[PDB]
Amino acid sequence: NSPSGVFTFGAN
Amino acid sequence: NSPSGVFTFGAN
Amino acid sequence: NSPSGVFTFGAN
Amino acid sequence: NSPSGVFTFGAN
Amino acid sequence: NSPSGVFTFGAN
Amino acid sequence: SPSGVFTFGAN
Amino acid sequence: PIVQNLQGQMVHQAISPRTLNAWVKVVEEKAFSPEVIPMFSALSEGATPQDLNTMLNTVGGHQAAMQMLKETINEEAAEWDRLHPVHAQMREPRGSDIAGTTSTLQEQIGWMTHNPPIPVGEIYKRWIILGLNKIVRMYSPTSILDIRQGPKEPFRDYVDRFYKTLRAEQASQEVKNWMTETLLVQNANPDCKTILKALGPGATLEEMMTACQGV
Amino acid sequence: PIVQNLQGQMVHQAISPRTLNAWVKVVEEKAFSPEVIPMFSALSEGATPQDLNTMLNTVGGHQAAMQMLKETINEEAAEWDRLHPVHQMREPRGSDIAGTTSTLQEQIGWMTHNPPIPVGEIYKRWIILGLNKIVRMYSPTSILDIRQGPKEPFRDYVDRFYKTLRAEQASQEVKNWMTETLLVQNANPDCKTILKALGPGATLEEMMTACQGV
Amino acid sequence: PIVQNLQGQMVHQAISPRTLNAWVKVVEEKAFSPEVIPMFSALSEGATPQDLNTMLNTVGGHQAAMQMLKETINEEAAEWDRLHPVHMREPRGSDIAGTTSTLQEQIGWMTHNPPIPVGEIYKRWIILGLNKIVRMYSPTSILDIRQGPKEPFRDYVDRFYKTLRAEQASQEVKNWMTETLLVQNANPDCKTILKALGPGATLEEMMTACQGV
Amino acid sequence: PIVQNLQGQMVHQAISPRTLNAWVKVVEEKAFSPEVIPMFSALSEGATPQDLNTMLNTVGGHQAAMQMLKETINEEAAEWDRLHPVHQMREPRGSDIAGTTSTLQEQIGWMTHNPPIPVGEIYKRWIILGLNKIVRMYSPTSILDIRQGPKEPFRDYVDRFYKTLRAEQASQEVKNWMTETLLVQNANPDCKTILKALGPGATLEEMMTACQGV
Amino acid sequence: PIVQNLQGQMVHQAISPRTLNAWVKVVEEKAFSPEVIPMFSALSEGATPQDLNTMLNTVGGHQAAMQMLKETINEEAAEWDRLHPVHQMREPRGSDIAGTTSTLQEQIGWMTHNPPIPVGEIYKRWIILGLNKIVRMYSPTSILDIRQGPKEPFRDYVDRFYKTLRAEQASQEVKNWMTETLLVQNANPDCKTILKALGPGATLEEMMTACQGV
Amino acid sequence: PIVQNLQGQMVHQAISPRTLNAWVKVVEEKAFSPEVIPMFSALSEGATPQDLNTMLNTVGGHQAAMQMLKETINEEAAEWDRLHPVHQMREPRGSDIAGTTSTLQEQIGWMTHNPPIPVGEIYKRWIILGLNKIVRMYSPTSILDIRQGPKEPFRDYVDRFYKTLRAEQASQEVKNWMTETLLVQNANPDCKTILKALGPGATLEEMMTACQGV
């Protein structure tokens, strides 16, 4: 299960 | 009522 | 008496 | 013994 | 007497 | 005369 | 931003470190005082949606506000998808493409440099500012109806408090006219309030302040 | 500002972050002391109406003064619409010069036409006229109330007098009368006799050197 | 970064001193708070692997995090080696990490037709390491975030969503947390004011309801 | 400053925000200590009269000194008008060189004609002539009042002496007489006996090394 | 650095005031913590030996380290004189690469030859070999001295361990042995219990994930 | 500095505001610590005599030192006048190299002649000879009074020693004697026995690593 990332806006 | 915007000068 | 402006030097 | 250098990433 | 200027070095 | 203060290079 | 490179291609220009450190400093210090929106709009100038997303992603604090902004951008993007039905020389952007979630940077620059341009940077900047407007209204510490002058307070410092609150609360211009004509007088202290009524209805803010200047 | 692109097209260069932060710090800290107008004019070189509006919108404090500035800009725009009734691009109305009606591409159009229609410079003048009124109003003490204290150095009184005289910004004939007849007369009773011993033709450098020990 | 010289050739523009000083200050002050990753991704735009390696080498503190990053980059490089079997010389994973590749190979790959964008691929492997680091450096779990008996709801939601951003669960877990932990962990004054709205209320409705409490 | 555009045209480069903030801090903090004149000249290289007037107008305090500067510029302009009668680009009168009558366009015209009339560097001379008088006057002490305290280090006294000697800016033969006679005669007794035991007319390096132990 | 001039000739680009100020701050604040060497290498990209010497000569503190660096550079230069016997421009001797017997014009000549002799990069290798020795010696503790406190979070102990391991800069076999064996062996009894329970195959992410609350 | 213009002419580039703020801060803070000379030489890269004079004139404090520098420049110029008698431009007298009797156009002429007459570098050497004398004099401690404290880390004493040895700048045979004999002799009683055990063949890395635990 991997972390989903921190970019609230845009393409991530 | 939607906010009218903060710009004192120019048309937003 | 309109204000004459604050430029001490130059073209005013 | 000669030091290997301090770069963690790349070619040193 | 007129002031001689404050440039220690060069042509004043 | 003083020898100059550069450690590296040609002074 | 976008720049024509030495080969004459329209190529991305990275949003500079100076611009990002300015924007971060602005948001973290001024805490959605209304100046944040014109300063965003200035630092934003020429931004692609990837650049706008870079600015908004770099904000560290106010994560409740950044979620209200994200929810507003989602509302605007869904409204775009409603107002512009999908088509049955280039792709036509959906709301998620203008918000820069489903578009590549080369699509974004494609649209922004098309003929006619489809200015997804300016469209998305409008949706961001529509979110920030709501946030700046919410982060106002006072309503204008609870801005009033103290018995010893200068009319200049009271007017500064009144118009800063009026700018944040950002009612319609007809209501700003009503508030500046009626409340600014009505909420002045008793020594100023009589002077302000003596000028009658037509007085400018300059006339009001220069009349109250010694009180 | 406006810049020639490498393709030979006229392009708006964004007003830089350091210019905006300099302007903000100037307005927020110096609170319409007279220096703000020269510093504004220096920072706003080559500015479009969009750049001028950006500068003025980025100010956060003094919103009373910013509303006096808006009301002055609207007044000067109405005077423009009175002097220039409407008739290869379209001519700017007063609201175009203020950058409300006009697009940035119209502003670049006018500012790079041949001959140019200098909407940026015209709007800068309207802004400076509003700032003139604000700077005059934000002056803390009128010149008639400037006088020299006991044991106040004459140079420090002259600094107060001419800073006040710069903020009040009367005509040069009035500034002449004030420097001739108030500066001497409002000096303290010790300096005042030295100054009058110089006679009415005295130059400020002569007044300051004569009073320097007192 | 990559630029074209006056001779019309693709040439390395050195990552500037000011960009490095900004990155160093960002990492050392913000200590893998989540805003470090978008700030990295913004400072490293157009970066070659040599530039990315310069940024990661210049970080002085947090050497535990930098080893988690290095071992993640090694894991991603080994998976690239498998996802792209060995056949401009095609890059192995160590080449994209900039360990076995010269700068001229990196610029060759990043400017080929089609390009092999080793700078972007490596930036993805770095950000995949930074994600795991940011998740781990999250100082408290979202289950621990609770509103104080006199804390404004606006400050509590700021703490909640900053923690939620760092801990970075999948979207359905965020849905459940923002719907139900955020309500449940509010203080006894706000908790009823929230429950009055019904469970479907948006964050702006919650923040305007609790505005004075 | 003046820059050649891409079209080869002579174009104004605006005096930058950081140059102005540097100049403002220089004047406000150093208060016509003598470094202000070399720093003015160095910040103002290649400046048009528009740029020089921008620097002078942006100065906030010290308005007494700015009037002494304005009086000097007016006197120098009147002298120019006396020596260069009015008769290509129109011949500049003194008020053109001060940048009052001339626009920025005529200033760049003169500064880029062949031969150029270097109105920016001429005006920078008139400004520095005004600043010389100001820096002389803002000197807090006559050199006759600079003397060494009991157990004050000789290097610190020499620093005070030559900073004062630089500010009051006598002619070089007078500076020679002062640095021969006053520099020794105003030393404290411990240093003064040493400096008189040295051969008369010792170099400053010999004087300072001899008195380093006192 | 080196730049192609407008004439197309190879020309020196001077190392900027901001780059030097950054380097001077880096050395004098960070006291040969290991990030000083990647920061040096980044600040000196494209540097000529004259640039690399302006950097090293502007370092004011740590003159003990700068002597160790000079001694190392002299050992490398003597080795270069040995491995490259003496016989476009002349082939550079070790003292030429160090910039002690070569002009900046000779350095640019070698660095822009075809093929180049990149005396800037060769010399920067000698500087970095000296800085490697200095950073090793300035390490405050051997890696064998790094041990966990009974109340110390495992993350802080790992940070201390790997910063020391980075400064000690042993060979990669030895770093592998240390990170596998010593990092566990030097943990406190609770963390050491958890870390043995993971077995030796755990990566640092697992080690920190398991010990996160201990 | 000097550049080639778009028209192909040799043209001045003024020393920037940022370079002057750097130089001024360097001199005012570091007070002729030896790093002032490398930092001068770095900021001065490519300077004409006008740029060099601009740097020196902008220094504010230490007016003792600035007169000792002026006296050194004057005697160096007199030696130039003696070794190079007067008989393309005129060949420069020493006053022309110092930029007192020469225009900026003469200076750029000489610095761009073929072969060049490098008056900027010649003058920069005379300045650095004066600064060498000043840096030697402003050294607060003589090396003979640098002693290690009873509890002082040897690395701090070595740093104090080599910083003094750099400032006082004896000849290399004397620096060799001092680093060999005094560094041992002035070490404290613990380090001194440690250092004796190394014998006369003790490099600085050996001395410092031997004392590293004390």
Residue numbers in the entry:
A (entry chain I), B (entry chain J), C (entry chain K), D (entry chain H), E (entry chain L): 1409 to 1420
F (entry chain G): 1410 to 1420
G (entry chain C): 1 to 88, 95 to 221
H (entry chain D), J (entry chain E), K (entry chain A), L (entry chain F): 1 to 87, 95 to 221
I (entry chain B): 1 to 87, 96 to 221
Provide the authors' original text about this structure.
pmcThe mature HIV-1 capsid is a conical, fullerene shell that encompasses the viral genome.
Inspection of these resulting densities revealed that the Nup153-bound hexamers adopt the high-tilt conformation at all tilt angles, suggesting that Nup153 binding stabilizes the switch in the high-tilt conformation even at low tilt angles. In contrast, we do not detect any density corresponding to peptides bound to pentamers, though in all three cases, peptide density is visible in the binding pocket of the hexamers immediately adjacent to the pentamers. In contrast, at the most highly tilted hexamer–hexamer contacts, including those in the vicinity of pentamers, R143 is positioned below the helix 8/9 loop and Q176 points upward. We did however, detect an increase in relative Nup153 peptide density at higher tilt angles, suggesting increased peptide occupancy. We posit that the increase in observed Nup153(1407-1429) occupancy at higher tilts correlates with the arrangement of the R143/Q176 tilt switch in the apo form, because the high-tilt conformation is favorable for Nup153(1407-1429) binding.
